[PDB]
Amino acid sequence: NINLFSSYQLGELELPNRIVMAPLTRSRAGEGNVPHQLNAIYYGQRASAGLIIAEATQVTPQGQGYPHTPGIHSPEQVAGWKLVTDTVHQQGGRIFLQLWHVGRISHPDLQPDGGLPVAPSAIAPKGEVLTYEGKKPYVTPRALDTSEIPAIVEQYRQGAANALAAGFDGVEIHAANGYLIDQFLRDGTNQRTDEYGGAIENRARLLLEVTEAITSVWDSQRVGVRLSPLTTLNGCVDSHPLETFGYVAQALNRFNLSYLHIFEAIDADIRHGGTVVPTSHLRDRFTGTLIVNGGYTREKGDTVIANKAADLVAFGTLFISNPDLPERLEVNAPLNKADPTTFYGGGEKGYTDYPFL
Ligand SMILES: Cc1cc2nc3c(=O)[nH]c(=O)nc-3n(C[C@H](O)[C@H](O)[C@H](O)COP(=O)(O)O)c2cc1C
Ligand SMILES: [Cl-]
């Protein structure tokens, strides 16, 4: 008799429901990659979520991969995010910041001094990347030196401390979707021969060291980690995802985190001889709160919470188009249809103008 509307204790935070707004890049940052009042309105409109996870936000300038995503590395960015967290709190909500470093998923045109994007290994992604001059081929990223990995961890640590000064309730470490930490996790993108490559413990080392550093800034119950075991996004694949992600789920127990958040790839069942990483494997392996995500509905989300298969259910696409998604789900209202043409960039249209019930 728990469902999507049941309250939940997440550390010291009292969530009114089990509905989470998934992190959604909207590429609507202002000059200097600073959030602004329109962003504050957008998140304030969605404050009925049990928890909002804000869009991926680069922790350092080299961590940007797409034009006009917000950062959390400068004082102006902290002040713009404070507008957002002030508004969400005024509206009675709770919000965590998703901390990002895109690693190889970038272009020199977006990097300081026009440098190469950094990565575990020098493997160019396939296809094209958007720059300020339009789409261009990806370049081959530079493989970080072993001695540079502490600087990466320290960029995440500072990002987390800036998020604390911005007034967030917590942080989510983006270890999913083929970005930097995921690039280290997966053997398709990591062919290093130091203590950060090879065995799973080595490939997970960057994640674990970033997590340790961030739990020295935040109470650990305010730190979450997102994984996406069966995505193929951004050319980042593991050859043994059950072993890799099962190991990671158990290795994170040390830290007493807020949660583990799993994005279940939408094509996992069909773009496999079935799902090779059942979330139940990770649920067994991680001893804390589990957030699931990917194509959820009222019916699917109620099932997973009733069954104890997950504690929280995050919705991405439906929160783009339904600012009051919890109320709509609760009363079985119609749901507004999301318009992909306004997902990224632009202004209020397709962002703050989806109507309330
Ligand atoms: C426009 C858009 C932007 C996204 N940006 C992010 C992001 O910033 N961080 C992230 O971890 N996932 C991101 N995702 C993935 C979503 O959080 C979510 O996992 C995915 O859309 C599947 O959930 P859904 O079926 O409820 O939409 C994005 C998805 C969309 C559609
Ligand atoms: Cl602390």
Residue numbers in the entry: 14 to 370
What is written in the article reporting this PDB entry?
To generalize this engineering approach for crystal contacts, a non-ADH-homologous enzyme was selected to apply the established strategies to the Nostoc sp. PCC 1720 ene reductase (NostocER). This oxidoreductase from the old yellow enzyme family (OYE, EC 1.6.99.1) catalyzes the trans-hydrogenations of activated alkenes, demonstrating its industrial relevance as a biocatalyst. As OYEs are strongly dependent on cost-intensive NADPH as a cofactor, Mähler et al. engineered NADH-accepting variants (NostocER1) by exchanging NostocER loop regions at cofactor-binding sites to ER loop regions from Achromobacter sp. JA81 and Acaryochloris marina with a higher NADH affinity. For this study, the NostocER1 Loop1,5 variant (NostocER1-L1,5) was selected as an example protein for the rational introduction of Lys–Glu interactions at crystal contacts to demonstrate the impact of rational single amino acid exchanges on the crystallizability of proteins and enhance protein crystallization.
Mutant Q350K crystallized similarly to the WT regarding crystal size and amount. Mutants Q204K and Q350K crystallized in space group P212121, with the RMSD of the crystalline environment in this crystal packing indicating structural differences. However, as demonstrated by Figure 8, the crystal contacts at the mutation sites were present as derived from the NspER1-L1,5 wild-type structure. The crystal contact at positions Q204K and Q350K both reveal an approximation of the intermolecular partners E89 (5.3 Å) and E27 (7.8 Å), respectively, compared to the WT. For mutants Q204K (4.5 Å) and Q350K (7.8 Å), the formation of a long-range ion pair between Lys–Glu, which could exhibit an interaction within a range of 5–10 Å, could account for the enhanced crystallizability, especially for mutant Q204K. Introducing a lysine at any of the neighboring NspER1-L1,5 positions Q350, (D352), and T354 led to an interaction with the intermolecular amino acid residue of E25/27. The neighboring NspER1-L1,5 mutants Q350K, D352K, and T354K led to an interaction with intermolecular E25/27 and an increase in crystallizability (Section 3.2, Section 3.3 and Section 3.4), with the strongest impact for T354K.
